[PDB]
Write a protein that binds this ligand. Structure first.
Ligand SMILES: *[C@@H]1O[C@H](CO)[C@@H](O[C@@H]2O[C@H](CO)[C@@H](O)[C@H](O)[C@H]2NC(C)=O)[C@H](O)[C@H]1NC(C)=O
Ligand SMILES: *[C@@H]1O[C@H](CO)[C@@H](O[C@@H]2O[C@H](CO)[C@@H](O)[C@H](O)[C@H]2NC(C)=O)[C@H](O)[C@H]1NC(C)=O
Ligand SMILES: *[C@@H]1O[C@H](CO)[C@@H](O[C@@H]2O[C@H](CO)[C@@H](O)[C@H](O)[C@H]2NC(C)=O)[C@H](O)[C@H]1NC(C)=O
Ligand SMILES: *[C@@H]1O[C@H](CO)[C@@H](O[C@@H]2O[C@H](CO)[C@@H](O)[C@H](O)[C@H]2NC(C)=O)[C@H](O)[C@H]1NC(C)=O
Ligand SMILES: *[C@@H]1O[C@H](CO)[C@@H](O)[C@H](O)[C@H]1NC(C)=O
Ligand SMILES: *[C@@H]1O[C@H](CO)[C@@H](O)[C@H](O)[C@H]1NC(C)=O
Ligand SMILES: *[C@@H]1O[C@H](CO)[C@@H](O)[C@H](O)[C@H]1NC(C)=O
Ligand SMILES: *[C@@H]1O[C@H](CO)[C@@H](O)[C@H](O)[C@H]1NC(C)=O
Ligand SMILES: *[C@@H]1O[C@H](CO)[C@@H](O)[C@H](O)[C@H]1NC(C)=O
Lengths: 366, 240, 49
């Protein structure tokens, strides 16, 4: 009545709507994933270099899960400016640069864009547009010694500041005054480098603190290093939506006997329609067929005479029917699946053509 | 660790008929008993190929087809680059018992770069200096190799085939399965073939040809292998 | 003055034409706040200088 937009319907067959078997769940299958970036030797090394000689490490062509790094509770200071940590596993650039050093506790804040200080201007400079993260964790139990750890030095005197991502290793004697010195200290000549005095007896803010700064660079070369991409299980004989190694499609997956050469990944038949996919994990060739869809039709003997109708599902096997889930006896024919009309043995003239040589009429509905 | 040389083994280049060689698989998608038309860079049919019997510097252009009728894996190395020095990135490729050995960075090559063999072999003197780089990769007969550099990806396709004829290229058809892909982009314009081992090598023959953009029609059998290829811009018959 | 306050942190985006005045702590990390900031928890609402 809705489709015809009328309050009366005469005898005949009409088409009302369509149906399709809806997918059940979601499955994604991805490669085994390997080649983790070597951050163990960076964040858990035997020792770190001095602040004015900060160690630089290049990370490229590997996978780096920042979720585990962020979940570590041993980091006292964890400051990320370019992106939020929760989105570290999502976006990535072409490579990573790690700058590792050791600074005093109160100087942790000095490693930040647009910040001034002895370390920030004589040892390491950060650009105001720096993107990445800075991680500072206490190393009193490792770097500091009861006898005084003089192994770490920091620059104190220089005429000019440091450029971003610039390292100075010069041992030239600073000449504050106008009197030149031939490499000896004097009235106005002093050593630009001073040794740290980290000791266990020192209070909070004086203990050695290891700082690693990760900066992500996005040169035009393709990105290689960022968080891993999750993988799931597989199902069969239940059409779902799948994301096989970036190839997304909906259908039911079965076993296939077709042969791929060892360099293909997924075949097709014609008109560029995928027909067989090899899973990235177990390397098995499958077959894809979407679940059936069909237009439903209503067979009615006319509103005037009666009010009971029969339903025809076109071109679908009588195995997946789903309120008319049961109704009456269900008939399966070549044209489709018929519900609500009983099948007889006789043979009369045709009234409401159904197809494949058969049709129905009102006696119930036969 | 290299020196100059006196015996200039400079010989005029010969010219050979290309016939119907230089076909590789354009896409990694399986197909069965189909006729698919695709356009790409290829070696045009029935062209002429330059034959070389030190080793000169040859342009790379769009792509390079390199063929060698060899015995017991004679040709080993490949040098790629624009200036072939420490000013611009250079590529070194070495063939061994494994698949390939690749270095991607600026080295210093002299007039006679060669690996050197010791007769148990231990010698490498193709370059002299190593400043910095990150990209290193490790994995009777006729060997065919297609070298392409497309949109930041370096692609090497390879194929080997047993042959008995000496002089001419075989009158046979065989596709070039893909071998190696590098997601690194370089603007290479020149390449050179490494020498083997004073050095004693006079019978070092190879065929060099170039690739151009054009359209082909490929026939895929029921097993997903290319059996026939037909050029388009060749003949009034081929266009039909 | 500190009479103007705004939110920095929220679980998700906001629907058009609606207002939220939930003055509650935010879980900025895997560690639950449980009503206490401690670590990885900050107040979304703060004033302007
Ligand atoms: C990913 O790793 C799994 C775990 O080993 C691999 O599964 C193995 O596959 C081999 C050969 O197919 C079998 O002999 C093993 O019994 C499998 N192990 C398990 C636990 O099932 C799988 O092949 C790997 N996928 C790759 C390398 O693509
Ligand atoms: C509707 O689906 C059923 C369930 O698979 C089909 O029944 C089987 O069909 C296969 C072929 O697809 C035969 O090899 C089996 O012998 C059938 N078994 C039974 C118990 O029927 C049924 O054939 C499908 N309907 C149509 C019209 O093909
Ligand atoms: C290592 O060598 C490379 C190659 O010359 C240098 O990389 C260049 O660095 C500049 C500076 O930002 C960039 O503009 C170029 O695009 C880079 N080119 C390449 C090919 O990488 C690099 O400076 C050298 N040093 C280090 C530490 O990597
Ligand atoms: C295509 O693949 C089929 C399946 O492997 C090949 O048929 C087999 O070929 C081998 C090789 O001679 C025989 O040993 C088998 O007995 C064949 N199987 C059958 C059922 O006949 C077929 O030869 C391949 N054809 C091409 C052109 O590659
Ligand atoms: C590395 O150090 C960090 C903090 O110093 C710590 O959280 C982590 O557990 C360490 N990893 C290993 C493998 O020791
Ligand atoms: C229904 O059928 C009866 C009997 O033939 C007839 O009198 C009546 O007019 C019909 N009404 C409609 C709406 O078809
Ligand atoms: C005839 O009817 C019987 C049941 O009464 C049924 O089993 C049989 O299949 C029918 N045959 C035909 C040809 O309709
Ligand atoms: C190339 O080969 C063809 C056929 O082998 C020959 O006719 C031609 O002279 C050769 N040289 C050039 C420059 O085309
Ligand atoms: C090669 O030169 C082009 C000149 O436009 C430049 O854009 C490209 O970056 C260069 N390639 C490399 C690897 O430097």
């Amino acid at each position: 009545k809705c489709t015809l937009k009328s309050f009366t319907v005469e005898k005949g067959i009409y088409q009302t709507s369509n149906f399709r078997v809806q997918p059940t769940e979601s499955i994604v299958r991805f490669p085994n994933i390997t080649n983790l970036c070597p951050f163990g030797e960076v964040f858990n090394a035997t020792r770190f270099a001095s602040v004015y000689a900060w160690n630089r490490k290049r990370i490229s062509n590997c996978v780096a899960d920042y979720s585990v790094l962020y979940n570590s509770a041993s980091f006292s200071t964890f400051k990320c400016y370019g992106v939020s940590p929760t989105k570290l596993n999502d976006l990535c650039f072409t490579n990573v640069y790690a700058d590792s050093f050791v600074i005093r506790g109160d100087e942790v804040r000095q490693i930040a864009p647009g910040q001034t200080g002895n370390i920030a201007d004589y040892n390491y400079k950060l650009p105001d547009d720096f993107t990445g993260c800075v991680i500072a964790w206490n190393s009193n139990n490792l770097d500091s010694k009861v006898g005084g750890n003089y192994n770490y030095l920091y620059r104190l005197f220089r005429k000019s500041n440091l450029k971003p991502f610039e390292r100075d290793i010069s041992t030239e004697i600073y000449q504050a005054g106008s009197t030149p010195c031939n490499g000896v200290k004097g009235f106005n000549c002093y050593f630009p480098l001073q040794s740290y005095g980290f000791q266990p007896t020192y209070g909070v803010g004086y203990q050695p603190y290891r700082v690693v700064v990760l900066s992500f660079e996005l040169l035009h070369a393709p990105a290689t290093v960022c968080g891993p991409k999750k993988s799931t299980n597989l199902v069969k004989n239940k059409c779902v939506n799948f994301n096989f190694n970036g190839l997304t499609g909906t259908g039911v997956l079965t076993e296939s006997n077709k042969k791929f050469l060892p360099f293909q990944q997924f075949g097709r038949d014609i008109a560029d329609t995928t027909d067989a996919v090899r899973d990235p994990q177990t390397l098995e060739i499958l077959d894809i067929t979407p679940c059936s869809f069909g237009g439903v039709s209503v067979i009615t003997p006319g509103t005037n005479t009666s009010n009971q109708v029969a339903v025809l599902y076109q071109g679908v096997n009588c195995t997946e029917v789903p309120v008319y889930s049961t109704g009456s006896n269900v008939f399966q024919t070549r044209a489709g699946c018929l519900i609500g009309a009983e099948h007889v043995n006789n043979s009369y003239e045709c009234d409401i053509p159904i197809g494949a040589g058969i049709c129905a009429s009102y006696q119930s509905i036969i | 660790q290299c020196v100059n040389f006196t015996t200039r083994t400079q010989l005029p280049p010969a010219y050979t008929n290309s016939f119907t060689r230089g076909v590789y698989y354009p896409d990694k998608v399986f197909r069965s008993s189909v006729l698919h038309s695709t356009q790409d860079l290829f070696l045009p049919f029935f062209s002429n190929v330059t034959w070389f019997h030190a080793n000169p510097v040859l342009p790379f252009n769009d792509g390079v087809y390199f063929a060698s009728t060899e015995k017991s894996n004679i040709i080993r190395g490949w040098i790629f680059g624009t200036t072939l020095d420490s000013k611009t990135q250079s590529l070194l490729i070495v063939n061994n018992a494994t698949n390939v050995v690749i270095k991607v960075c600026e080295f210093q090559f002299c007039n006679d770069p060669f690996l050197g063999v010791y007769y148990m072999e231990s010698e490498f003197r193709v370059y002299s200096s190593a400043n910095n780089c990150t990209f290193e990769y490790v994995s009777k007969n006729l060997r065919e190799f297609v070298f392409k550099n497309i949109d930041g990806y370096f692609k090497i396709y390879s194929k080997h085939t047993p042959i008995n004829l000496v002089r001419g290229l075989p009158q046979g058809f065989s596709a070039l399965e893909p071998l190696v892909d590098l997601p690194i982009g370089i603007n290479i314009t020149r390449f050179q073939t490494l020498h083997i081992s004073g050095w004693t090598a006079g019978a070092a023959a190879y065929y060099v040809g170039y690739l151009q953009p054009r359209t082909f029609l490929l026939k895929y059998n029921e097993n997903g292998t290319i059996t026939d290829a037909v050029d388009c811009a060749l003949d009034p018959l081929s266009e039909t």
